[PDB]
Design a protein around this ligand. Structure first.
Ligand SMILES: Nc1ncnc2c1ncn2[C@@H]1O[C@H](COP(=O)(O)OP(=O)(O)O)[C@@H](O)[C@H]1O
Ligand SMILES: Nc1ncnc2c1ncn2[C@@H]1O[C@H](COP(=O)(O)OP(=O)(O)O)[C@@H](O)[C@H]1O
Ligand SMILES: Nc1ncnc2c1ncn2[C@@H]1O[C@H](COP(=O)(O)OP(=O)(O)O)[C@@H](O)[C@H]1O
Ligand code: BEF
Ligand code: BEF
Ligand code: BEF
Ligand SMILES: [Mg+2]
Ligand SMILES: [Mg+2]
Ligand SMILES: [Mg+2]
Ligand SMILES: [Zn+2]
Ligand SMILES: [Zn+2]
Ligand SMILES: [Zn+2]
Ligand SMILES: [Zn+2]
Lengths: 374, 337, 369, 371, 366
DNA sequence: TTTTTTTTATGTACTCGTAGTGTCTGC
DNA sequence: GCAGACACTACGAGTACATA
């Protein structure tokens, strides 16, 4: 708040203690138990998708390893070591950006200095970021180092796709996996962020931001920063909706209903309104397809619908119980063929209109009238 | 067409572009769209000869200057050419990168600099994208010349950069007269060759000059034998060759004329072969003709596009699938809906 | 192809042969690039070496019978043949077809040639301007800026150095995007400002040609080429085309903080501190306090190095992190006793200068702070 | 000579301030708000179609970021930094054509050199255009810097295809999407340019250029230069209509009428006549698709048909009256797949012939003569 | 620090006598008989999959060959040579991490010591680990040494891929190939290790840990340590089951099993989990298509199982037997259509869900 | 018993031979 | 001086491997 330096939310709000990490209860509990009880393994591999915390948790473990109060599961913020780690100036936290130092010569250099003891630290940490980037010779140079490391050196690896690492490396190092974050967790974290930082916000905009960056919190933080930029320094529903290009679920389902009940004039009116609003036509097709898929899923089971669409939940049910699944299959196929063939239509508006007209003509119940003359 | 023959059907456009280049109102990156053998190479050569040396009278060649001596001998270092390695078939991005950096290192002789890509359709994605900034912001008095047979095949990000010029095919009667003067063959054969090459007199001249006419007549005889018996496999003996895509295009043209005859179109494309089109119309159903045409076009495209694909296997598979289709009670394919 | 009968003495050739040797042999990119051009004309022998973009010829007086012509002779073979002969021994050369027979006393060598026409040359031109500068001054100009040239950088500008003139002053500027080296020296003649860019290799041969003699180096500045003259030696090379960064725009605008100290002490201290520096970055942090200098160095092996220097400083304390290799090179070039430094801010460029006189100046851009 | 070389409109008319943008207001508002406040970011990724403005937007952002007036939402051309950024030769703005240098060695050298402090600039701006062509090794090399860069470093990336970039790189930057320009905006920009250049123009020619630009302003400028070169120094309707091969008669309408009537002889005669005059085939298929779209709309709503095609309204009314919607949909689908198939079988004439034959195949062509 | 001292289960429990190596009975018996009869080949090259004891058995060989009590299959721990083998500081045992010393310079420097007699051992024993990566000139030097080897030098090469080794070295080396450890042996030694330490355990949990590791003992022990860390000091069935669910990777097989049984809730949960475990949807659908192809092929001939499905054979046999070929063909066609249709759909998770729903709709399950 | 058999474009490492560059040691 | 030696570093070429 008071910091005139508008630090990026992706950087300012990096986790400080294990209490500041949202989600990933598996890895958090595992590390807390393996650091309170002891038995610290000599190699870790955090495998997960983008922007889930593959590096910050490694830094938290580094803080928890060599702290002035001993090996602790609660990284303090008072002693010099933890603050030096956070500032990135710490002596023993050797942050090996494996993307740059990927050649086997650099790995040999790293292994040469492994035995030279730590300075002002219980352990020396070799935090190798993006290990899946090293060359094959670099991968294999550190085998006997990983299997029998010195008592004061601990590796902490962090990769996006562990499948590209050789199988023996997956054997040697612990394999911790970080699941993608859920929508509710992202929304709660963003509410925390926009409450700590004095920025007014609206819950619907926060839900939209959380859904638009599914599975990755850094994506959500970047989108929230860009929405703050797009808005007048506040996260409002209108600003987020206009920025994302998404169309509000209520109005897309209104178009879907107008298509299902064979009301051509309502379809045309809603199309004209969307054209006036400037929403991308392909985005409109995407939203209609997503809603049709959600209808199919709620036909599969009523539990398939979460609170995310709660605003129109009733309408959703009123579409699930009134039409057979075969109609949904036909509608999805027609709209998807339309999306596939859109880029070659005379215009995107022309293509979307023609696709909707085709879905209207070919739909089974109360189809369009045919010419009176045979 | 051995090398760079001046073409009368090129004379108008030429002077027009000179009128644009002489007045300093010409785009740096000009994309030529012309048929294969239309003469775009000669147009680019004449333009480069005008550009790269001391200003001549204002038209024709550049006279007897150092520029002409270096250009005719192919020694001018300000005349960069992009041609695929004969061992390869595509413009490696390394060649384009080297040319662009050499262009960035300023000219060697007096005057402007000219970069000419011998064919835009042969650019790979990396090679095509390595030219984007250079086309957008040429260093200083740098003029590009890209030749292609269809701008749509080229990347959209490159078609934006270049001002597009169109070399329209000459009127069919004039091209027929020109070819009859150049080559002594009957009118029907001449017309069929011209329509086969989409009205490109240079391509028809190339077809006549080589053995392509003998290959076409051999394919015609093989088709005449195979159509009534239903033994299309023998056509393999005439279809497998380094020029397989062209012969597949000829086969597709024959099938198109067969469907035309079924619909009784007033215009055809294989004028000098009425017997084959009559036999194809008689012995084959229109749906079968359409299916065979689609399969042949698909196989030709697959042969031409995917580099390194085995010709023999594809041609044999096409012939066997056609054999299967000719048998009664076999479901024909439809275009991917 | 007339017969080619040289009759020469070693003492008149070994130095010219060494001078014309230059960047020959080494990497043969193509045969007709050749080895040498030997030319007999009007009682003079012209020996030419090239690099497909560079040329240089030595003139040797022929005080004995000769036969005019032009041919080639292998570089390493001829050089070693001439070097290995007894001191002062004569050399007699004959041509039979394409074969050179070289004789010294009773020693005979056969050598292969290539046609002189196949050799590549540089087109003649009209010179733009011309200088006649003393050898010592030219050496001072080159040595003050040679080190700062870039090493095969993508920015081709940085791959060479610029010579410009303003009235009676000749200014030489070199840079690589992190270092700047400018040196202005008096000329004695007034010529218009025609800037020229000379590539690194050409500068190397300019340095090699200079022998610290009384004969002034003549230079012809052209449009896209350069020519040089040292006594009987002629040289020419191509030029890098473009514009250098404005050094006045790089030099600090508010050099408020002043420092003065001894060159030897600073160089020795920086050499001591660079031992523990990061071998991939060579970054050292400098703390300037009241009459005190402090240098701190760290490396991935976690070793720490601290050095303290007595200095005269009247400003405020400041921290600044910059490369130690650059300052070591600057101090190596600066051969005087006392060196002054001008500083502005923790992330501002640092100006290094001679305390005795303005002469030449240098600029170092600091590292991340 | 002000133009030593032809400063083509695609280069002369590059925007210099934020007020010269043709209407990318959604991203411009965010940029102006960010620059006006302290909210500044270290990684901007502008993406979208070709010739839409993202390189110009990035250059304008650099100008605003480095001008000595301050961090201004509107950069000042008087500033020396702006004077140098608009041209080349700026020690801070490092523009890298990513496709030109895709090798990981160049990216590694750049990331080695990023550590040094900027020279006389507030921010050392790295503008990497066409970033989607970088080798995957360079992509992974550009991860740890973009996440915690030095304060004095700002990264500006531009690409025409966000999908090709790894998701990790997208996850660290502000993604701005530049919508394709509508017809009206392109027409207004073109009329403003041509009025500023003292070159005569006609509204119909400008409308045709905007229509054929396909939403890209660089395409519009290139087409305008085509018209200027082939229009004797003026943008005229006749010149642009001739160069584009556009249809002024009812050739497309007669062709589709013959096709829906299943008169193969008439269809092929009309296509031969079209080949005689050299009508561009892609435009013919586009016009046929548009006419079929209008047929479907009038079948759904006769009022909608009331349009520019008033002089031919009766024909489309009859076709809508006599043709079922399913047949129109099948025709549109066949013609659309055919349009997808034009850059196949390089002789495009027989490609359109294939498409027309496929369209004709649906209705019965039986020799059975009946009224 | 203030946590007493707890080593790593992978490095600890490494065998020190030939009777402590579990499995690989043929190699140990052959080595024992060879040492008993005095028939020792010049070079022993070990090979096999990861974590089956190649390095450990080679180290045991090096300890045995220099034992003062004599060359035996069961070297004592008494000998100071044996103790120095334990500590890793033995003058006569030359451990060369060939994965690090690949260059010919270091290899030649270390192979020029063959001329020097052993300091305190009968044989100068080279343990060149990870021999597969080695420069070609280093292979030339090693071959020249092995062609005329001194009688007091024995080589102990270890590797994971013997194919990369040149044939000239293979033809001079007695090669011992080590099998992937059987599940029962892995479970037995895991039980014994957990009992020797003061760690409680459960039978089903132990079986799950054994099955999770793909026949490699190091994998089993690493997962054991990770589960102990996650299990709050106890190897409990629920904790390890949840851990392995988080680390579960063969999603496609479970997706196929749920799809063929028309279990909508199960397939929805599985795809939700596969979404949480961030992956590529195209890759998942390609894997599903390939598994269906294999199931269709196996029904025609059992020999289609091959070697890749060694750890998957049990479920694939049941799937092939229990499902008619027509249903498999229909599922393959549906999934192929879905994969062709996937990129144009909404976000690929939606497309995969829709394709799975399409496949599920065929069965009459309600 | 004997020969039979390959898809490129672009990029990234790895390792050895040869040369170019510095510098400094008793020569 | 000092040039050779010796180190040291860089560059080409041949080979192996990855991704699309
Ligand atoms: N579990 C999490 N809890 C809180 N913030 C997170 C979490 N994961 C990611 N972030 C946000 O993302 C930023 C960078 O996260 P990082 O840990 O680098 O992800 P990665 O695993 O890709 O390296 C953090 O500063 C934080 O704001
Ligand atoms: N928003 C805009 N305002 C004004 N001119 C524009 C705009 N966008 C594009 N242009 C025109 O297009 C030309 C190229 O624009 P550019 O910014 O390079 O597009 P890109 O995003 O594809 O790199 C400019 O020179 C300018 O004439
Ligand atoms: N046959 C075995 N018997 C007992 N433990 C084994 C065996 N194979 C592997 N291990 C376990 O794996 C750990 C590492 O074994 P190692 O022999 O180094 O495998 P590698 O063949 O890959 O070098 C050993 O400490 C041991 O715990
Ligand atoms: F940004 Be994370 F390390 F992928
Ligand atoms: F032509 Be733009 F950079 F997409
Ligand atoms: F040490 Be083993 F080869 F994984
Ligand atoms: Mg990370
Ligand atoms: Mg651009
Ligand atoms: Mg091992
Ligand atoms: Zn602490
Ligand atoms: Zn001329
Ligand atoms: Zn300004
Ligand atoms: Zn013993």
């Amino acid at each position: 708040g008071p910091h005139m330096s508008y630090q990026v939310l992706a950087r300012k709000w990096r986790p400080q203690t294990f209490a500041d990490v949202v989600g990933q209860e598996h890895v958090l509990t595992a590390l807390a138990n393996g650091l309170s009880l002891g038995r610290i393994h000599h190699a870790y591999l955090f495998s997960g998708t983008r922007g889930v915390g593959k590096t910050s948790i490694a830094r938290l473990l580094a803080k928890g390893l060599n702290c002035e109060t001993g090996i602790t599961a609660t990284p303090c913020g008072v002693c010099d070591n933890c603050r030096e780690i956070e500032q990135g100036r710490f002596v023993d936290l050797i942050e090996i950006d494996a993307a740059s130092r990927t050649k086997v010569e650099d790995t040999r250099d790293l292994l040469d200095n492994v035995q030279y003891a730590p300075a002002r630290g219980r352990f020396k940490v070799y935090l190798i970021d993006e290990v899946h980037m090293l060359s094959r010779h670099s991968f294999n140079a550190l085998l006997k180092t990983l299997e029998e490391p010195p008592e004061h050196v601990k590796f902490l690896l962090a990769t996006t796709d562990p499948q590209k690492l050789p199988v023996t490396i997956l054997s040697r190092c612990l394999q911790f996996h970080l699941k993608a974050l859920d929508v509710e967790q992202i929304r709660h974290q963003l509410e925390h962020i926009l409450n700590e930082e004095h920025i007014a916000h609206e819950p619907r905009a926060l839900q939209l931001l959380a859904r638009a960056a599914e599975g990755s919190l850094r994506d959500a933080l970047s989108l929230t920063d860009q929405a703050i930029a797009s808005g007048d320094g506040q996260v409002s529903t209108q600003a987020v909706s206009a920025m994302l290009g998404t169309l509000d679920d209520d109005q897309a389902l209104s178009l879907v209903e107008a298509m299902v009940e064979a009301n051509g004039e309502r379809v045309m009116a809603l199309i004209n309104e969307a054209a006036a609003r400037g929403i991308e036509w392909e985005a409109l097709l995407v939203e209609m397809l997503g809603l049709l898929h959600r209808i199919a899923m709620v036909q599969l089971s009523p539990a398939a619908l979460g609170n995310d669409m709660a605003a129109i939940e009733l309408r959703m049910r009123e579409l699930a119980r009134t039409i057979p699944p075969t109609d949904i299959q036909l509608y999805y196929q027609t709209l998807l063929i339309g999306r596939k063939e859109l880029p070659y239509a005379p215009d995107r508006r022309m293509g979307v209109e023609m696709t909707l007209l085709r879905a209207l003509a070919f739909h089974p119940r109360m189809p369009l009238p045919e010419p009176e003359v045979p | 067409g051995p090398h760079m023959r001046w073409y009368p059907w090129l004379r108008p456009d030429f002077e027009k572009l000179v009128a644009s280049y002489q007045a300093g109102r010409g785009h740096h990156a000009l994309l030529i769209q012309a048929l294969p053998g239309m003469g775009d190479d000669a147009l680019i050569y004449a333009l480069s000869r005008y550009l790269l040396c001391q200003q001549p009278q204002g038209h024709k060649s550049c006279g007897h200057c150092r520029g002409c001596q270096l250009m005719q001998a192919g020694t001018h270092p300000d005349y960069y050419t992009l041609a695929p390695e004969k061992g390869k078939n595509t413009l490696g991005v390394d060649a384009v990168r080297e040319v662009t950096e050499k262009l960035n290192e300023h000219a060697r002789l007096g005057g402007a600099k000219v970069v000419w890509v011998t064919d835009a359709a042969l650019l790979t994605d990396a090679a095509a994208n390595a030219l984007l900034k250079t086309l957008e912001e040429p260093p200083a008095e740098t003029w590009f010349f890209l030749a292609t047979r269809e701008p749509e095949r080229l990347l959209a990000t490159l078609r934006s950069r270049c001002r597009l010029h169109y070399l329209a095919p000459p009127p069919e009667q004039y091209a027929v007269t020109w070819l009859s003067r150049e080559v002594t063959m009957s009118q029907d054969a001449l017309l069929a060759a011209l329509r086969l090459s989409a009205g490109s007199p240079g391509a028809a001249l190339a077809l006549f000059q080589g053995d392509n006419w003998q290959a076409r007549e051999t394919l015609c005889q093989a088709l005449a034998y195979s159509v009534p018996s239903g033994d299309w496999y023998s056509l393999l003996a005439a279809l497998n060759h380094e020029q397989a895509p062209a012969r597949l295009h000829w086969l597709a043209t024959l099938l198109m004329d067969a469907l035309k005859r079924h619909h009784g179109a007033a215009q055809v494309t294989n004028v000098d072969v009425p017997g084959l089109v009559a036999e194809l119309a008689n012995h084959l159903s229109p749906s079968r003709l359409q299916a065979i045409l689609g399969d042949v076009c698909h196989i030709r495209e697959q042969l031409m596009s995917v580099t390194g694909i085995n010709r023999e296997l594809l041609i044999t598979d096409l012939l066997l699938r056609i054999e299967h289709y000719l048998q009664p009670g076999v479901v024909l394919p439809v275009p991917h809906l | 192809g007339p017969h080619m009968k040289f009759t020469v003495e070693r003492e008149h050739l070994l130095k010219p042969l060494q001078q014309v040797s230059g960047p020959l042999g080494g990497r043969p990119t193509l045969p007709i690039l050749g080895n040498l051009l030997l030319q007999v004309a009007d009682g003079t022998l012209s020996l030419t070496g090239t690099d497909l973009e560079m040329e240089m010829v030595a003139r040797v007086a022929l005080v004995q019978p000769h036969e005019p012509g032009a041919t080639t002779v292998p570089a390493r073979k001829f050089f070693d043949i001439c070097r290995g002969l007894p001191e002062g021994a004569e050399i007699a050369v004959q041509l039979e077809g394409e074969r050179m027979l070289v004789r010294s006393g009773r020693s005979r060598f056969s050598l292969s040639t290539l046609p002189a026409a196949d050799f590549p040359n540089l087109d003649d031109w009209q010179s733009e301007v011309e200088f006649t500068l003393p050898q010592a001054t030219m050496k001072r100009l080159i040595e003050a800026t040679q080190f700062s040239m870039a090493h095969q950088d993508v920015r081709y500008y940085l791959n060479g150095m610029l010579f410009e003139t303003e009235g009676e002053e000749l200014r030489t500027v070199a840079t690589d995007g992190h270092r700047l080296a400018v040196c202005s020296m008096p000329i004695g003649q007034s010529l218009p400002s025609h800037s020229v860019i000379v590539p690194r290799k050409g500068v190397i041969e300019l340095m090699r040609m200079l022998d610290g003699g009384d004969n002034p180096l003549r230079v012809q500045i052209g449009s896209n080429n350069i020519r040089a003259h040292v006594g009987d030696f002629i040289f020419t090379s191509k030029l890098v085309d473009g514009r250098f960064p404005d050094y006045r725009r790089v030099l600090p605008k508010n050099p408020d903080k002043h420092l003065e100290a001894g060159c030897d002490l600073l160089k020795q201290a920086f050499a001591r501190a660079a031992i523990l520096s990061n071998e991939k970055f060579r970054g050292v942090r400098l703390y300037v306090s009241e009459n005190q200098l402090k240098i701190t160095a760290n490396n991935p092996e976690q070793e720490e190095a601290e050095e303290i220097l007595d200095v005269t400083y009247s400003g405020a304390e400041m921290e600044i992190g910059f490369n130690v290799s650059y300052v070591l090179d600057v101090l190596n070039a600066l051969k005087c006793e006392n060196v002054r430094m001008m500083l502005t801010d923790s992330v501002s460029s640092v100006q290094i200068e001679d305390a005795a006189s303005q002469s030449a100046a240098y600029v170092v851009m600091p590292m991340r702070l």
